[PDB]
Design a protein around this ligand. Sequence first.
Ligand SMILES: NCCCCC(=O)N[C@H]1Cc2ccccc2[C@H]1Cc1ccc2c(c1C(=O)O)OCO2
Ligand SMILES: NCCCCC(=O)N[C@H]1Cc2ccccc2[C@H]1Cc1ccc2c(c1C(=O)O)OCO2
Lengths: 148, 148
Amino acid sequence: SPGIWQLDCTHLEGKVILVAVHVASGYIEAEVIPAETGQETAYFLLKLAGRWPVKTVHTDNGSNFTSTTVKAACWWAGIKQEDGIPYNPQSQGVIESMNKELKKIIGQVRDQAEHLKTAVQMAVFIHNHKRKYSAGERIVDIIATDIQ
Amino acid sequence: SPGIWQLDCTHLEGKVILVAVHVASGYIEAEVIPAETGQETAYFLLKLAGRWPVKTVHTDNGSNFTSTTVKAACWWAGIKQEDGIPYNPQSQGVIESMNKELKKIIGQVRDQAEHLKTAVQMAVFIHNHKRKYSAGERIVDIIATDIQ
Ligand SMILES: NCCCCC(=O)N[C@H]1Cc2ccccc2[C@H]1Cc1ccc2c(c1C(=O)O)OCO2
Ligand SMILES: NCCCCC(=O)N[C@H]1Cc2ccccc2[C@H]1Cc1ccc2c(c1C(=O)O)OCO2
């Protein structure tokens, strides 16, 4: 569980926001892309796995699960690719809630940024720093504990 | 010192690789950009600060130090912007060594990627996972200790 992430794709302003959530902490990384292709997803996962110890990824849909490019990236980065089928429905809803929460934050900052990508990164910042401990704190504590 | 990062800009294939190094661990994040502008640097810092607790940034040159856009991003993200003047001279060399080491790794993977950006993210991955403990391990341990 320190190494488990979930992909999530949501839409805003005719664009796609691709999100990776560290399941145990709620910590996220996100990017804006024109559309969700295997290529974009593969590149995003490579970035993520270089930055955090990504062991398992629950893919967001069957197209990405099937994608040979995504499979190649997962092989390259040592990621076990899994389906994102919510066998525990606290996952349809927990994801929905995150997308709504992120879009809320994006709207709160949207006027401060010319470009959506900037607003999205502002939202990532606010989300990961928000004391509820913060998600940023939780992920670091979880991984440090695992390491030792 | 858990919050201190250093910017570093290096060149390859007519492109620019912008690197942020967490000084205490050697952990890096990096991106390829067409050229090093205040706008690109500001966006890069926003991304970084959303993902790790960036307190202080030693900027890579005076243009970025001066940039009103970089200053705005640093204000937004709660980053103290500092000059990157190596008052402890082992620093120009430690950066030079990192750039040479990253370019070496990039050359070792370059053939596996159509695009330089992919090779750069492969290099980030290899760099942060390399046992020497790894840089990824060191940054997490340093921050977890600080938090607690
Ligand atoms: N509408 C207000 C105009 C902003 C003037 C100004 O300096 N803003 C800061 C605020 C702020 C706050 C955090 C980070 C960057 C920025 C800058 C914006 C910016 C910079 C770089 C970018 C951007 C944009 C963007 O504006 O999206 O896009 C991709 O690279
Ligand atoms: N056999 C038919 C095609 C094989 C190609 C193939 O799947 N390579 C993997 C290897 C590999 C290893 C790690 C991550 C991605 C990739 C993929 C490459 C790739 C994917 C997405 C991208 C890229 C590139 C790129 O090539 O730079 O650029 C920006 O977004």
